[PDB]
Amino acid sequence: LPRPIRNLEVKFTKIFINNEWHESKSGKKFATCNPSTREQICEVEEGDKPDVDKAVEAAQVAFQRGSPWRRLDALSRGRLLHQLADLVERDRATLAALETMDTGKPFLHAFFIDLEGCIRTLRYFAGWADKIQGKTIPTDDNVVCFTRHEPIGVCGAITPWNFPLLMLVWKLAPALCCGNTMVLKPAEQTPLTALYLGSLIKEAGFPPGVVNIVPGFGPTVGAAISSHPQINKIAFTGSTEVGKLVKEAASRSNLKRVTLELGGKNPCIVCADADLDLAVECAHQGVFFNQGQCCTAASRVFVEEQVYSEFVRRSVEYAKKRPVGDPFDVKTEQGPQIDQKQFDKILELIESGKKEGAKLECGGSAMEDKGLFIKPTVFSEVTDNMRIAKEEIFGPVQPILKFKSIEEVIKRANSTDYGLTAAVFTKNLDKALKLASALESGTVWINCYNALYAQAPFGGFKMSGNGRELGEYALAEYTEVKTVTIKLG
Amino acid sequence: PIRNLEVKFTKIFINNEWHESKSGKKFATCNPSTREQICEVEEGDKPDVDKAVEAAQVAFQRGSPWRRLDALSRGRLLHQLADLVERDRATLAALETMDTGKPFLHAFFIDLEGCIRTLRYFAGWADKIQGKTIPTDDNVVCFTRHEPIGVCGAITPWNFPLLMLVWKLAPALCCGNTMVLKPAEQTPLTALYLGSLIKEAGFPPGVVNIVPGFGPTVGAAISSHPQINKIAFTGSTEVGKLVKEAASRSNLKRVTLELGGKNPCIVCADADLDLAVECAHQGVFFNQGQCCTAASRVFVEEQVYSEFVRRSVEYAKKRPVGDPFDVKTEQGPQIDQKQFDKILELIESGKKEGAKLECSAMPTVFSEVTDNMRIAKEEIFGPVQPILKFKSIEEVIKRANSTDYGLTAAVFTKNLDKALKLASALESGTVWINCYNALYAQAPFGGFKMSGNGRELGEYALAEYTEVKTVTIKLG
Amino acid sequence: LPRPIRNLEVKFTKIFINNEWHESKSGKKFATCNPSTREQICEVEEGDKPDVDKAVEAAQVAFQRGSPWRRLDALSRGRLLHQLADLVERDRATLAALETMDTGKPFLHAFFIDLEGCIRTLRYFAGWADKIQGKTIPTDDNVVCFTRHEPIGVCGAITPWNFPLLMLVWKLAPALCCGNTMVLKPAEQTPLTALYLGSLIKEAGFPPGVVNIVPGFGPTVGAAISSHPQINKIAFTGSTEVGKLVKEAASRSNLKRVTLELGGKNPCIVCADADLDLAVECAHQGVFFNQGQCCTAASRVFVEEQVYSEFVRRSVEYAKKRPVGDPFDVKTEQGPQIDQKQFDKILELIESGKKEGAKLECGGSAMEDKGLFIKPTVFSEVTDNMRIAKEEIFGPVQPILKFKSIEEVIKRANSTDYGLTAAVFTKNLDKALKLASALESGTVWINCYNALYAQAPFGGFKMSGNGRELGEYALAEYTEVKTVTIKLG
Amino acid sequence: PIRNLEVKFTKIFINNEWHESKSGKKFATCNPSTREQICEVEEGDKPDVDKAVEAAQVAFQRGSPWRRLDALSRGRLLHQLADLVERDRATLAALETMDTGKPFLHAFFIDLEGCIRTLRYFAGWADKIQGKTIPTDDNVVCFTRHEPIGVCGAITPWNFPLLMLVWKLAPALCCGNTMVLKPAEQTPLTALYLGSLIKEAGFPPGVVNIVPGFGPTVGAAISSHPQINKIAFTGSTEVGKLVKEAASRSNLKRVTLELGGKNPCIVCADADLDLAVECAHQGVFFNQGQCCTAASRVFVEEQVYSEFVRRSVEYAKKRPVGDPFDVKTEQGPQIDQKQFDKILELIESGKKEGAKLECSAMPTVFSEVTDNMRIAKEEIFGPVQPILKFKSIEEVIKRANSTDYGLTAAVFTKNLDKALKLASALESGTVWINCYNALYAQAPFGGFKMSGNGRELGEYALAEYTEVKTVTIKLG
Numbered sequence A, C: 001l002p003r004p005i006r007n008l009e010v011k012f013t014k015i016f017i018n019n020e021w022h023e024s025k026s027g028k029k030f031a032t033c034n035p036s037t038r039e040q041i042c043e044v045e046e047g048d049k050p051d052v053d054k055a056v057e058a059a060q061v062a063f064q065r066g067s068p069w070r071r072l073d074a075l076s077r078g079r080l081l082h083q084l085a086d087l088v089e090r091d092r093a094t095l096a097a098l099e100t101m102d103t104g105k106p107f108l109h110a111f112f113i114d115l116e117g118c119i120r121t122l123r124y125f126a127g128w129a130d131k132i133q134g135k136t137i138p139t140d141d142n143v144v145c146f147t148r149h150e151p152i153g154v155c156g157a158i159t160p161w162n163f164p165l166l167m168l169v170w171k172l173a174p175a176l177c178c179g180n181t182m183v184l185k186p187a188e189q190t191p192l193t194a195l196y197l198g199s200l201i202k203e204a205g206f207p208p209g210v211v212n213i214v215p216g217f218g219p220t221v222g223a224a225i226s227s228h229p230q231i232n233k234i235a236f237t238g239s240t241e242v243g244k245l246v247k248e249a250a251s252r253s254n255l256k257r258v259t260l261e262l263g264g265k266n267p268c269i270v271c272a273d274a275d276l277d278l279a280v281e282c283a284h285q286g287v288f289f290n291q292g293q294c295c296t297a298a299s300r301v302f303v304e305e306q307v308y309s310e311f312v313r314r315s316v317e318y319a320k321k322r323p324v325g326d327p328f329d330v331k332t333e334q335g336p337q338i339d340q341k342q343f344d345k346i347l348e349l350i351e352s353g354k355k356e357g358a359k360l361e362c363g364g365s366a367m368e369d370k371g372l373f374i375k376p377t378v379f380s381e382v383t384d385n386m387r388i389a390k391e392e393i394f395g396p397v398q399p400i401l402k403f404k405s406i407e408e409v410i411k412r413a414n415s416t417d418y419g420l421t422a423a424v425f426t427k428n429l430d431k432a433l434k435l436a437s438a439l440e441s442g443t444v445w446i447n448c449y450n451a452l453y454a455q456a457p458f459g460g461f462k463m464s465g466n467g468r469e470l471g472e473y474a475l476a477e478y479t480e481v482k483t484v485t486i487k488l489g
Numbered sequence B, D: 001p002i003r004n005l006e007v008k009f010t011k012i013f014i015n016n017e018w019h020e021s022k023s024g025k026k027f028a029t030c031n032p033s034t035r036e037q038i039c040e041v042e043e044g045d046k047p048d049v050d051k052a053v054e055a056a057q058v059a060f061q062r063g064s065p066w067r068r069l070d071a072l073s074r075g076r077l078l079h080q081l082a083d084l085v086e087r088d089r090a091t092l093a094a095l096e097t098m099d100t101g102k103p104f105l106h107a108f109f110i111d112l113e114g115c116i117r118t119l120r121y122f123a124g125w126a127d128k129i130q131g132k133t134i135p136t137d138d139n140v141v142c143f144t145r146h147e148p149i150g151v152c153g154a155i156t157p158w159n160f161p162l163l164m165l166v167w168k169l170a171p172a173l174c175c176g177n178t179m180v181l182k183p184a185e186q187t188p189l190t191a192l193y194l195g196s197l198i199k200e201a202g203f204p205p206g207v208v209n210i211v212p213g214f215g216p217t218v219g220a221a222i223s224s225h226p227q228i229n230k231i232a233f234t235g236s237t238e239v240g241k242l243v244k245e246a247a248s249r250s251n252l253k254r255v256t257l258e259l260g261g262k263n264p265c266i267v268c269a270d271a272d273l274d275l276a277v278e279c280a281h282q283g284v285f286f287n288q289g290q291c292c293t294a295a296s297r298v299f300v301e302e303q304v305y306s307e308f309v310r311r312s313v314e315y316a317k318k319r320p321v322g323d324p325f326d327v328k329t330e331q332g333p334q335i336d337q338k339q340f341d342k343i344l345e346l347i348e349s350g351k352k353e354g355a356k357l358e359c360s361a362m363p364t365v366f367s368e369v370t371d372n373m374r375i376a377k378e379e380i381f382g383p384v385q386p387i388l389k390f391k392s393i394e395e396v397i398k399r400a401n402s403t404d405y406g407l408t409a410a411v412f413t414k415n416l417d418k419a420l421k422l423a424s425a426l427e428s429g430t431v432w433i434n435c436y437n438a439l440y441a442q443a444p445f446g447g448f449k450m451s452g453n454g455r456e457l458g459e460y461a462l463a464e465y466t467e468v469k470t471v472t473i474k475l476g
C-alpha cells in the first residue's frame, strides 16, 4: 500500500566505524547492481584487512571494561534496541526500497516480510536484554556456587544476499542485547541496507564502536574477519562450502566460537490426506517465494501415490499464474534472479532435469531477456539420484517426487546431509507427529511454510549449521558461561 | 592397594565384543612410575574406527533398543554403570596408577569419586531434559525438542584418563547419543576396562565403542569421519586447533574443546595466607605439576608479597616424594620426557631475565618474576611457581586478563567488594575463591578465550549433546 | 506374576516420630477394615493434636539450622531417596499386599500401578535433589543479584484412600529432595502402607524427625495439622469441601502455603473420527479403573451423533466383561468399594439416573451381597443437568452424552468448576489440538487415559486444586524464593 | 510542580466507560498533607463489582480481541501504556502527592519510575513465557502450556498506590488475564487516572476494570466473587488472612499476598557505618516511616553499638520537614490518625521497660533496646529506630529469625563470609547487603513466613498469573 519510491537515491556508501563514515584505506571502491534493470546502482567502498583491523580495534575499545557501552544498565541497553527498531519503523519504506533495488525483491515482500521480520526481531531481543539470567547451583553446605552469562566480545557477522537486512539483524539483535560489540561484513551484492542501518545505529544513540560495518568481498574483508585474532565469535549465513572455510579458519586462528546457517535439500513432504489446495499454495510460494532464492526453499517435494498424479496437475496451474516482472510492480511475486552465474547456474540444472528424465510441466527456459527473469518451472517423475532433486537449486524449480509409505519418506527425506527445514502437510495426528519426530531438520513446519518467529529458533541439522538463531537459544551463542565457586571459613 | 594386579582387557571394544585391530598391530603402554611395560594393546586405525562408528550408527538408528528406552530407563543404566565403577573401584585406581603413576589415593579418592559422582549426576538429567513450548500466534502451536545429536566422538588426555572420559560419556549417554571413544596412548587401560563394565550393566551393544590407538591414526580418523556428528576433545591446545580444523573440513560436525591455559592466581593483602599459600600449593604442584587447572601465574600484593614468598617456600618442599602406592607421598613421576626436558629447561628460562629463584631432578619456587618472562608467559604444565607483585585491583585485572588462556582462576580475599569485583572481571570459565580445584558435577567446567569452547560438568553440559528441533504447527 | 500373600500379618501399627514407634498420648486406638471381606484388619493408634504437636516439634528440630539433615550434601540427600526407593523395590510385594487388604485394590493393580508409580516417583525427585537451581539476575552495573531456592520447612501431608501410598509419595518425594521435614497424616481407612513406609524411611538412613506419621481422623489429627502455627506448608489430596476447609484454616493460623488436588467432573470427549475400540477400552478402564474410585475418573463421556449410538453399544459389552470379585484374584480388574456410605452413596445416584430419564444399559444394582461389590453400570441419553452427569460419582458408572459441534463440547465441557483431567480421542490433528487448547483441565490426555509420569505435572484447574504435583513444577511448592542483592563500593 | 491541578476521573471504570455506582453513593478522598478534601469518588459495591467481573469475563473468553492477540501484540500494548505513563508523569506524581502527601519528588522519581520500569520489564516477558516439552516414553508426546488464569483480582494499599497497582497489573497483563482492580480508599486517585491511559493505548475494553470503594464493601466482594479466578493483595497482615479465608471459602481462587513484617537490619563490627547508619536511616524513616520494607529492628555489634547509636542520632534529625511540594523536605505527613495515635503511644511503650531513648509531634531514635519490648516486638510502621546490641553471628541469626515476619533484611559488612553466611541464614524474601530498598523489576519481591506468600516483580511473578496445563499425546 505504500507508494513505490522509484528514484530513491543512494545516500550512504562508506565503511562505518566508531560511528563515522570512512573511505577505504585501500582507496579502491566497488559497485552494486540492480538485477531487475541490469544497471549500476552505486559504488561503495571496497574494504580489506587493514579496514577490518581498523573496525576490530574499535569494537575492542567499545567493549573495554568501563567503556560507556559496558557500563550501561542491562535495560538501558535493551532500551537502545527499542528505539533502533523504532528508527527502522520510521524509514521502513526507505530500506524496503533499497533492498528491492539491490536484490530484485518484490517491494511488497521487502515491506511486509523482510522489514517486518526485522523490526519484530529487534523487539524480541530488546526484551531479552534485562532477562539474560545465569544460575545458582547447590554444591556443598559450605560453598556458594553460581554462573554468570557474560558477553563474548567482538563478534563478526557475514551475511548473504538472499535476505541481506534480515539475516544480518538476526545476528545483531541478540549479539547486542547480550552486550557485545560487532564488526559486520554484508554481501557485496547487497551492501546498501547494511550501511543505511549503520546510520540508525548511530541515531539510536549507540556508543561509537559497538557496531562497525566494512563492505567488501568474501576473500578480502570476509576472510580477514574469520581469522582476526581479536574477534571472539563469528556468525555466518551463506554457502555450505564457505561455511566449511570460515569455521576451519577461525579454528586455526584463535579458536573463536562460530555459528553457521547454510540451507540445504529441504524436503516438503505431502501426505495423501492433506488439504492439497493448501499444500499446493504453500509448497508453491515455499519453493518459489522470493524468486526461489531462500535457505528454506523447498528442494524436494514428496507426494503419496494416492494424490501424486493429482498434485502435479494442481501445482502446474499455480506456477503459471505466479506473476514474474518488475520488482516495484504491485502485482508481482517473483522478480529477477540475483546475478549472472546464478542466472546461468539455475538455467543449467533446468536442462539437467530435461536431460535426465524429469517430466517437465511448465516453463522450460527463461523469458524477458532484458533482465534476469526465469519462467517458474515444475518437474514431475523426479527420482532420488537426479540432479534437480539431489542439488541445491535456487531459482524457481519444483521437482516433485513419489512416495508410498511413511517410513519410505522418513528414510528418503533424511537421505541427505542438509537438515535445515522440512514441511509436512497432513490432517492426520500420528502421521503429523511421527514425521516431525523422525525428520532430521532443524525446523519442521506442519500445514504451513516459512513460519519463522523471533521467538522460535532457526538452525541447521547435520551439515546445515551449528547452533541456532532467532530464539531464546540464540543467547547461548552470544554469551560465555562463567562458574563462580566460593568457599567459606 | 593391589600389588600384582593383572590386566584382562586390551582390545578394541565394539558392539560389546572385543576385537583385534584390522591392522593386527599393537602398542605397549608402559608404567610411567617404574619405567617398565604393562601390556600391549590392539592399535586401532581408520578401519577399526570405520567399524565402531558404523556400529554406533546402527545402535543409534530408530527402533534400536537404545533409541526406544524410556528416559528414566536410559538414566537407570547410568546409575547401574556408576554402581559397577563404585564396585570395581580399587581395580580402576590400581590401573590408573599402574598406567599413569598417580598416587593410588589420588586415583581412588579423586579420579574415581569424580567418575562416580559425575555419572550419578547425569543419571538424574535423563528424564529432565525439557524443551520449550513457545507462544507465537493464536492458531499456531510452536515448541522445541532437544533431540540427541547422534554418534559422538570423545578424545581424552592422560591427565585424568578415566575421569576426562566420563565427563563426556556421562552427559552424552543421558541423551540419545552413541559414542566412539579414543583414549590417550600413554593411558588406555582404565578406558578399556570401563568398556567391560559398560557391557556388564546391560547397555544395548554399539551404544559405546572404545578404539585405542594413536593421535594421528585413530584420533585423526574420528575428527574427520563423515558419520560422526559431534566430537568432545580434552588435551593440547594446538592439537585442538587441528580437530576443529578437521571437523570443519569434513562433516561440519559439532566440536567442543577443553584445552589448557595459564591460570592466574591472585592473593590480595587481605588474604588468609595460610589458606592462600596452601591452596596455591596444591594448585600448581598437585598431581606432579601436570593439570589443566594448574596455576601458571600467582599475583600477590606488595603488603604480602615478601611474606608470601617466604611461607610459600617453607611449605613448598613438604610434599614427600616416593612410590605411587605409598601413603607417604603426594607426588609421583611424569609420563613422557618431553615434559621433563621442557621443564628443567624452562626453569633456567626464568633465570636469563631478572628473576630470583627461591628453590634439579632425582619442586621449584620462583620469585621476583615480571610478566615479560618465560616463567610467566607460557604454560608451565609442571611443578613451578612464578610469583609476581602488584598494587591495584585494576592492575591484576588487566594483567591476569591480558593472556589468551581463561580456563580457571583463584582469588584469595576476605573482602566482599574485592571478591566480587575480581570475580566479575576475570576472563575465566571458572573463578575459584578461597579454594582451588573445587570441582562439582553440578557446576559446568570449560574455558574462555583459547582455553577451549563449550562446557562440561553442568546442566550446560547437556547443551553440547543435543540438537534443537523447532516444530511449528498451524491450525485452520 | 508374584504369588499373592493372603495371610500377611500387619506388623506396623503406631505413630512414627523421630524414627521411633509410639502409643498415642490419647491412649485410644482405632481399627482399619478390609472392604473385600468385611473384616477388621488391625487396630492402629488414634492420633490427636497432642500427638501432632509432638511430631511437629520433631520436624522443627530436624529442620533446625545445623541439624544432621540440613547439613547434608544436596546429593547425599538425593542419595537417600534413592535407597529408599530401593527399599520400596525390595518389599514391593509386602506393600502391594497391604494396599489391597486395606483398600480392595486388585493386587495386580497395586503392584504394576500403585507401587510402580511410587518407586518411579521416588527416583525422579532423587535426581532433582542436586539440580534445584536458583537464578542470577542482571540488575545494575554495580550490583550483584541472585536468588536461592530454600526449603520451606515443616510440611504437612494429608492423603486420601483412593491411592494411599501413591498420593502420599507424590508429596514426600519432592518435599524431601528439596530438604524439608514432614508430618504426614494418612486416611484412617488406609493407614497401613503409610506406616510401613515409615520403617523404610528409617532403614534408608534418614535423620530422626525429617519425617513423621501420625494416623488418625480428619477432624482430630488432620485439622490439628492444617492449623499448627509451626507447619509452614500443607499438601492435601481429598474432597473439594475438605479442601476448602484446609486452605481456609491454614489462612487463619499462620498463612502457611497450601496446595490442593480435589478431582472433579473430568470430561472424556470422543470425536466421530476416533479409534473407537481404543476410545471404548480406555474410556472404560478410565471410568471403571480401581473400582471407579479415582480423581481422574471419567465422569462425563461425550460422543458425536456420528458414532453416538454405535459407541453406547460398544461400551456395554466391555462393562459386562469387566470381572468383579476377589482383590487377590489374579483375573480381577474391579473389586469391592471402599466403605459403607460410599457403597450407599454410589448406589444412590444409580437410581438417580434411573429415576431421572437416563437409559440404563448394564447392571442397575449391586451383587454379591457379602462384600461391597457393585455391578459395572452404563448409562445412555444422559443430559447436562442430570445427577449422574452433574455430580462426582465414584463407583463404576459411565454416563454417556451426545454432542454435535466441537464448539458445543468445548462449551459444555468447561461448563463445570472441576478442570482436573480431560481425555480426547481423535485421529484428527486440528480437532485434537483445538480441543486441548480450549479445554480448561489441568491435564489433557489424547488417545489415552491415566497417562501419568513422574516427569509431567498433575494439578487442578478452577476448583480442582492449587499448584501442581508430579513435575519439575512440583519443586515450586516445596521451596521459598529468596532475593539477594549486594551493592559494591 | 503543578499547583492547582484538577481531577478529571473519579468513577468506576468498566469496559473503558466511566460508570456511576449502582449504589449511587460516593466517598471523598481527602488531602493527607493539608487536611482538606480533594473530590468525591463513586463508591462501588457488590453490584458494581458484579459488573466489572462479568465485564472481564467477556473480554477474556475465547475469540475476544484480547485472547486472540499475538504475544508480542500483547507486549506492545504494555509498552504503549508505559509510554503514556511516561508522558503523563508529573500529573501522576501530582495526584500521588495530592492523594497521599508524599514528596512530589519521591512520587515523581521513585513511584512513577518504578511504575514505568516495572511496566517495560513485563512487556518483554509477553512473548517469552515458555512451557516445557517433557520426555516420557517413545511413542508419547508430552508438554505443558502456561495458559493465563483468567479474571484476576488486585487489591492495593495506600503505601505506594499506583506502584503497588502496577506490580500486579503489569505481569497479569503480559498473560491472558483480565483484571478487576480495587485500590485503597485513602488513595484512589492515581489508580483511576491510569484507567484513562489504559483506554488511551488501545487495550480492547473489559481487559482492565477499576472499581473504587471500601475494604469490607468492594474488596470483600472481590475476594469472594465466584467468577474471579485469582487475587493479588498488598496490605495489612490480618486483612490478608481474611482474603485468603474468603477466597478459600468461595471459589478456591488463587491468592497471592504481600503483607508487612518487622524487617531486621544487621550491622557488624566491620561495617561502613557512614553507609550502615545512613542506609538504616532511609530504611526506617523514609516515606514518613510507613513502608512494607521499613526496618523495625536494628541489630548492632558491641564494638560498634555505642558509636553506632551516636551517629545514628546526630544524623537522625537531618531530614527536613515541610510541605510535600517543597524541594526542601524528604518527609511529609501521614494519612490516617490510627497510625499517629498508635505511634506516639508505642513511643512510650518502649519507655515502660528498660530502654533509653535518644531523641513528640508538631523523628525518634530509641536505644538500649532488648528484644522483650514493644519497640522490638511489633510492626512500628512509623518513624522509630529500636537499636539492639549483640556479639555472635549465630546470635543475630536466631534473633532476627525468631519472628514470624521475613519480608526483607539488610546486612552491612565488608567481610565475604559474614556477608554470605548471614544471607543464607536470614529467613527473608529479600536480603539486602550494603544497601536498602534496592528494588528492581528484575528481582522478585515477596515475603517468607507470615510476611505473605508468592512473588512479584520478577520472572517468578509470572508463576502467579498462569495455570499449567499438561498435554499427553499417545501414538500408535
Ligand SMILES: NC(=O)c1ccc[n+]([C@@H]2O[C@H](COP(=O)([O-])OP(=O)(O)OC[C@H]3O[C@@H](n4cnc5c(N)ncnc54)[C@H](O)[C@@H]3O)[C@@H](O)[C@H]2O)c1
Binding pocket: A158, A159, A160, A161, A162, A185, A186, A187, A188, A216, A217, A218, A219, A221, A222, A223, A224, A226, A237, A238, A239, A240, A242, A243, A245, A246, A341, A342
Ligand atoms: N567461482 C566458482 O567456481 C563458483 C562455483 C559455483 C558457484 N559460485 C558462486 O557462489 C555464489 C553463492 O553466493 P551466496 O551468497 O549464496 O553464498 P556465499 O558463501 O558465496 O556468501 C556468503 C557470505 O560469506 C562471504 N564470503 C564468501 N566467501 C568468503 C570467504 N572465503 N571467506 C569469508 N567470507 C566469505 C561473502 O562475502 C558473503 O557475504 C554464487 O553466486 C555462485 O556464482 C562460484
Ligand SMILES: NC(=O)c1ccc[n+]([C@@H]2O[C@H](COP(=O)([O-])OP(=O)(O)OC[C@H]3O[C@@H](n4cnc5c(N)ncnc54)[C@H](O)[C@@H]3O)[C@@H](O)[C@H]2O)c1
Binding pocket: C158, C159, C160, C161, C162, C185, C186, C187, C188, C216, C217, C218, C219, C221, C222, C223, C224, C226, C237, C238, C239, C240, C242, C243, C245, C246, C341, C342
Ligand atoms: N458426614 C456426611 O454428611 C457426609 C456426606 C457426604 C459424604 N461423606 C463422606 O465423605 C467421604 C469422602 O472421603 P474422601 O477420602 O474421598 O475425601 P476426604 O476429604 O473425606 O479425606 C481426605 C483427607 O483429608 C482428611 N480430612 C478429612 N476431613 C478433614 C478435616 N476437617 N480437616 C483436616 N483433614 C481432614 C482425611 O483424614 C483424609 O485423609 C466419604 O466417605 C463419604 O462417606 C460424608
Ligand SMILES: c1ccc(-c2ccc3nc(-c4ccccc4)cn3c2)cc1
Binding pocket: B109, B110, B113, B114, B115, B117, B118, B439, B440, B441
Ligand atoms: C568433578 C571431578 C572431581 C570431583 C571430586 C570428587 C571427589 C573429591 N574428593 C575431594 C577431596 C579430596 C581431599 C579432601 C577433600 C575432598 C575432592 N573431590 C573432587 C568432583 C567433580
